[PDB]
Design a protein around this nucleic acid. Sequence first.
RNA 1: AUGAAAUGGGAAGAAAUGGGCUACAUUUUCUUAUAAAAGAACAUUACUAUACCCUUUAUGAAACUAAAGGACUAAGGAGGAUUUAGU
Lengths: 208, 132, 101, 260
Amino acid sequence: SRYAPEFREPLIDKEYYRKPVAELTEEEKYDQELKKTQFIKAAAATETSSVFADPVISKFTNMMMKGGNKVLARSLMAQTLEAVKRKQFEKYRAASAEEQATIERNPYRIFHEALKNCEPVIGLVPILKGGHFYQVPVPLADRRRRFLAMKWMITECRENKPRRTLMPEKLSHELLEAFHNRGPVIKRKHNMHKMAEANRALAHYRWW
Amino acid sequence: KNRAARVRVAKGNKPVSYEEAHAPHYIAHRKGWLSLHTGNLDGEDHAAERTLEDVFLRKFMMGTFPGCLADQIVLKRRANQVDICALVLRQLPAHKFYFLVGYSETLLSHFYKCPVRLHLQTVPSKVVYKYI
Amino acid sequence: YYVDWRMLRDLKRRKMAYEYADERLRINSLRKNTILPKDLQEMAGDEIAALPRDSCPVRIRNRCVMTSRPRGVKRRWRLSRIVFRHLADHGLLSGVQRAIW
Amino acid sequence: CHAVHFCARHDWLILHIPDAHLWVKNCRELLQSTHNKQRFDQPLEASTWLKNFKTTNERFLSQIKVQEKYVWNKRESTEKGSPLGEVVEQGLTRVRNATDAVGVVLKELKAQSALGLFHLLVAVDGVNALWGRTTLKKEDRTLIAPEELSLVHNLRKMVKNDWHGGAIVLSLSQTGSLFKSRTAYLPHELLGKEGFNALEPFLPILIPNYNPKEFESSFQYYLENNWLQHEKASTEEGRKELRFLSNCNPEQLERLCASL
RNA sequence: AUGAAAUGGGAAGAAAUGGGCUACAUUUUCUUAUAAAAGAACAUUACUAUACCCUUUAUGAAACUAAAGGACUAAGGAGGAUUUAGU
Ligand SMILES: [K+]
Ligand SMILES: [Mg+2]
Ligand SMILES: [Mg+2]
Ligand SMILES: [Mg+2]
Ligand SMILES: [Mg+2]
Ligand SMILES: [Mg+2]
């Protein structure tokens, strides 16, 4: 890295800086005073104070990008969100007043609740004990649990789709199916959890 | 291990001059260039001919002053003038140096068709930068 | 004495190409066009072929002037990579230094 | 399209070319013309337009009647006096004659309009395609020119001011244009020297970006339909952000709001 | 003569293996722009050869070389054990 270890990650929260001084906890108040005598990293090209920037969706975009084609990957995510909004508007208009209440037309809220439905609480680590490969039930961190949900989505759509279907049409159809706990990405989570019960007694081999 | 132009370590009894002590990576950092011409500057011609002339001029001075050279010679080209600056030990009588200067200048001026001058600074003995 | 017999043959190739440069230019000009009758061009195609083979300028090889090495030469100094490094690593090339960056 | 609605409601005869770039590129069937062997016929391109022209002007297709005899084939011809609908019907029935039925329609309407029977709105969107370059190749793998094409040649007459009884409404579009820069919008840049001279004297009508009143009206329309579903979109900081990113451009605002 | 010079040759696999290039496509194919956007293409020859072959051009004395077109199509449907690189 070209940043020395003494550099601090930038804080790009607009409201945080403009809060009244008394509203800030003394711990936060102390850090701000310390940061005045430190070096701050430059903000990333994609780090902005925009009110429409969601870290979860921005991360999902980077996991789809191939060869640094951010314009294409962002376009694919923009087309997906729109394909989900247009799919719920059609259902909402073609539904009764009672049914209309339940229907969710926010694509950003369908994406977050979809991913969370696919996240697995426990995973598996492959281990070779006595020249035999065993996978031991592991408890997954918040970072490993989130990564696996996004990875499983980007892999079901990339591979298990018809040749002429497009990613905005497969991903939209999968975010909505996961949003209802019916999709194949949810089935992957159910299989992972079910296998952990099979290897329930083999967690002892853990050394880490 | 890199071997180029590196005088290696022994037991602290080997005298080395400043020029010998410094390895190639110190060129332009601690020690300069023995030859100074304009043939390696950008957009300049006749580098090969200046480099070939230098190789010969160094072998000529070594043989013409056998055992009388304290250090490598310095070649300075200005216009068509050539200037040879050599540190020479005080071994030979004074009149012998006057003979070799007149001879080496005339011979090298009629060989390369340029005015060549010899500049000799006499040292009592080789100057030792460090014992390695 | 030149470095080796290979450098000697090259020197002769370079001195015979200089003698036949004008001749091979004038004859070859008659062939590199579409304005002259093809009969003349076919005849000029044989006059150039009849000239001695060492007059042909593609038979010259650039060799290190000091070691006669056929490959590894740098055309600006006419020296092999091994000979160039010996002069450069000793401060004997005017303005050549190691590249650190 | 706003002008085409005004004339359509006043009982004008609508001759609306939706996109004129589609006739100078990506043609998979390119025949030759019997009328003039130099020219070429685009069967599929003409057939699609006729089916739409029929729908828009279905009412006026029975009143207007041909003033001449047209021999489609040795066995098929149109007798003088028959309704103009018959010319359109044959073009759809026999795709080979589709590129010629269009020419008859354009010729008939242009001639009969001056008689006071009907008004004629020649609405050509993307008119800069007519006097530009094409990306169509002949059997020799040599690029064709717009004049050679049959549909392009007929239309160039309709956009001329040598008739009366109607009005011509033209639009420029760099989108879909061939061999033009991305940042070219001015009339001479897109039309060229040939296209400009063809249409002058014309009345240029600049279509600018949304003004402050128009931007707020469009923003409220999206909010009125629940399109802007993001929680922060309705806020003053959301609106100000969308004004910056879109820059008040109608298309950019529609695209940004689509994802939100 | 184990020295010097001239002329003509220094072949062949397709067999194993190392590295690389390209493709197997839809986050793709072609066209204009320029990587924005649009119009077409999208499985039997669609994706897809920098092979063979056929023309033209460049260098040269010599094309056996390279490039650019043209046809012609083959195989390829994301690669077992295993393994390389990247903070
Ligand atoms: K091989
Ligand atoms: Mg020897
Ligand atoms: Mg050569
Ligand atoms: Mg693009
Ligand atoms: Mg093909
Ligand atoms: Mg030739």
